[PDB]
Amino acid sequence: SWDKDVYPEPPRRTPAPSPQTSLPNPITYLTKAFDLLVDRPVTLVREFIERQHAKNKYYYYHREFRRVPDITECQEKDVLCMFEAEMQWRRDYKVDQEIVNIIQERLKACQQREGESHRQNCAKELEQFTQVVKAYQDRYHDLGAHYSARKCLAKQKQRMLAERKAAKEA
């Protein structure tokens, strides 16, 4: 249904029923009633719907975008090149927003899954979130509402200049 590598889940460890009471478990009978009254009728309706879908199989595709020269290769004021570089940058910006959203979803899922041990047991997810938020902030933060590839490039060059200066004097 979804890629487990993209949305990982640790293997699930359920304990076996180990009762130490003679009373019947009300949940067990309710569980059986639910599977009989709710699950079985629901599954039959779905299986009928899946039969109709199997008769009419058709396909859709994930659009693929070829890479084009980015803003750094565009001559000043050459709108024809700047336009394609700008459109590509805007698409990449939307993709990076969703990459951060995937990492945040991993982090939130880990916190709920690990319960009271989440602080120790979600260190890897918190690290990856921390690193990706830093990279995303470096690319896109402070550009303003009228952002562009040109402004993003100006931001990067300022950062590279500072990093060069610090490295040289060090």
């Binding site: 803003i71 565009c74 001559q75 000043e76 402070d142 509402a145 100006a154 931001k155």
Partner: peptide
């Protein structure tokens, strides 16, 4: 000159 060579000051918002 291409934008890779041209220096533009960045003004954060």
């Amino acid at each position: 000159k291409t934008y890779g060579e041209v220096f533009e000051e960045f003004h954060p918002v």
